[model samples]
Target chain A: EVKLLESGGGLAQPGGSLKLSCAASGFDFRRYWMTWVRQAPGKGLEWIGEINPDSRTINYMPSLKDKFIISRDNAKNSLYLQLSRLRSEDSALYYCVRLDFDVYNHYYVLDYWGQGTSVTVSSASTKGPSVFPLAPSSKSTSGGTAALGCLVKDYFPEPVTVSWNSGALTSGVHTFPAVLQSSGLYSLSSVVTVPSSSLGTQTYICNVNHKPSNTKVDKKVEPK
Target chain B: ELVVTQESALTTSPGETVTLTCRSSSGAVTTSNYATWVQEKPDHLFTGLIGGTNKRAPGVPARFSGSLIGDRAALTITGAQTEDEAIYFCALWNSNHLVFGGGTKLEIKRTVAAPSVFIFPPSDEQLKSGTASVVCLLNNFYPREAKVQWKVDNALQSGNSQESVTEQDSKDSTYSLSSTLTLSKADYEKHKVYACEVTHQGLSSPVTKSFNRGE
Candidate 1:
């Protein structure tokens, strides 16, 4: 009888860490498994890992290795997932999913989901039901800039990794973590200034890898 | 895509072999070889136990084991216990993904209090201490999930026994499991203690009733 409560709000800083929770209630915490996921509209989904409240056993995803931490506060009937190195890409809706053995086939699927909490570059709260999107601004030419943004309305904190790819764009590039706005949202932006000619209608990919499955999609942008 | 169900609890004598079954959809499983077992505390994480048809993980004790048929997987405990109380799950892995069945709520079942007995009967003078018979009777139990057994000093002792069980009339039936055993008076009077154990499938522990017979 475990119920998950996804609640969070915080400011962001470069090289900083932010903490949030997917608390649970309505049932004994000693008998069920609570998990977290990260969902960004077009980008697909990520599986962060899960924590056993009774035994405190922690199983994590290899992709999130060292970048995210999973823990529980039994007294509070809640679970926590902490993200480090705040970057624009790290901003998304994080959710806590309830895993149960009550189904007929005993198959493990998200039986319940929390209304996700938003961690963003800005401190402002907003409404959302989002998908992970390809970074729209990572393809700027020499001396140009690109900004990446994320949104969250639930507490789905699975592992999400975002990177960029370009053509004729030498080793010259700049990547930066996002900062929380006074309103408390999370966002990250990267600016790669390559020679203007190098912009030749190149494509930028915001690839996020995770599970139940691993998938990728591209959000193309033409450099000015 | 198969579903397996088990009893929520059990009670048994020490050293008694308890078989907890994971019944798949009335027919057969997609593939028996893909089944596995996992144990997890309520409100906690899940850990893998016997997988791919009874292959115990490295550190797991020999007592925990499994088996698979066309559309079913089975887990058995050779020596029943009280410390094995935990929710057990049966699952299978295919297409690089995991498929699972509903979990069973396993627990120890308590044997009912029976009619008390008197040590020495009035005719004892003529009846030399050669052999004697005693009857163990139990009251009606609710929900039909409990069972009974006889034990000596917490250990399972064998004897002539009868088992009256219940069958599902739509998943929730109420006649409770019970048993009665007849043993030689010599064995009973000689042992320091006596007990009865009850059991169910997919449970980790069995509850029991015991008595001390003075020598």
Candidate 2:
């Protein structure tokens, strides 16, 4: 006999996105509605939301109305919880849940449950960020508005600095918040628009400063 | 024929100069007598300190010098170390027989102390066995020579053998020694206790310690 559940979990970065899955198996998964619940660090359990496969509808607590999403995938046979705009307070063990309907009293009975996923939302790490060699932006290389990329990863404690060593590229720089990784560290990507003529020749420097570890990496990249 | 004689015993404070005189029993003291001085660190541990009148023995400390003083061959210790507090013997070569002086017992101490005696009974396991050994330790006494005896009910116990009584030097320049007695467990059947007796220089009588089997 196979058991019923396994839930997805992991680290989430502040201002990042998260998706958790409840893999329900062994029985008629479609007939029963699945839910999402979480226990905050040292706190009690709170109901995040529930998903209805029959109508493709969801009911969620007002506390998470802004960033939590509950959904079911018919083909994947799994329930999902999508959280956007993440923060440290959202750190928790998330469980994909199930319930049965009781007739007379009209109540929901939680009987079978998935083993929860653990999410540690620490955006800071003592390990300095790792920087990959700069490369061309594949998406923009298809047109004239070209871009060079820098991937800084595995850092913590937020707000790292990234820059182009050459001046005159300030308006075209775009750096995002470091997204939490499965390894519980963070990775961030940045791009700086550059002229095609100056893309190579090792003239441009992509410098990443990880503040927590007081580390800096300068990579020279070109369009390939 | 010649005879040699020395003081029966001599005492001095540590670091005090002392001269032990040897007489050839009424003859002029001179190098022809071939005067030799020997030291006994008790227990028959002997070493020659001077040979041939005034010549100090090889490796002898400079504080020791032998010379003819007022017609008596004298071995002078300018400054006595605690280690010098032992038996000193002088020998003179004769035509037929070697004549040695009756050893001079030397005491170099600030104070004389009786031996501190302690007797430890046999272990419980030893008491339960057929035979066992009892330990008696004597510590911190002035003169190095010591005597140990074992008795039960005041009757001397025979066959209780021990290691040769040897003195161990102490930090305060005193002596310590150990004496062990062995007995058959059957002996404790009648005698309720085994007593260890110690005799040294300062004690009026032999000091005693008793061990009741397993008590």
Cα lDDT of model 1 by residue, A1-224, tens digit: 44566766333554678888876777776577777766443232345667776735766655545677878877877788888877767767777766553334433434456766666543333322122321222232112323222211112223333445633332423222322322233333222333345444555443333221233433333332
TM-score of chain A of 1: 0.49
Q: For candidate 2 chain A, which ten residues in a row score worst on lDDT? A: A137-146
- Write candidate 2's Cα lDDT for A58-90 as tens digits: 666655455987778767678888888888778
Off by over 4 Å in 2: A1-224, B42-47, B95-98, B112-116, B123-133, B143-171, B177-184, B191-212
Pick the lDDT winner: 2
lDDT of 1 by residue, B1-215 (tens): 43455555554444566655565554665443256666644223345566556567656778887775334567777775645555666654443334445565455343432211111110221124343222122222333444456666666645454443322111111222324343546665566765655453323465444445532
Please report how far candidate 1 places residue B65 from its true position, in Å. 30
True-structure lDDT of candidate 1: 0.47
Q: List the residue pairs that clash in candidate 2.
A: A123-A157, A124-A156, A124-A157, A125-A156
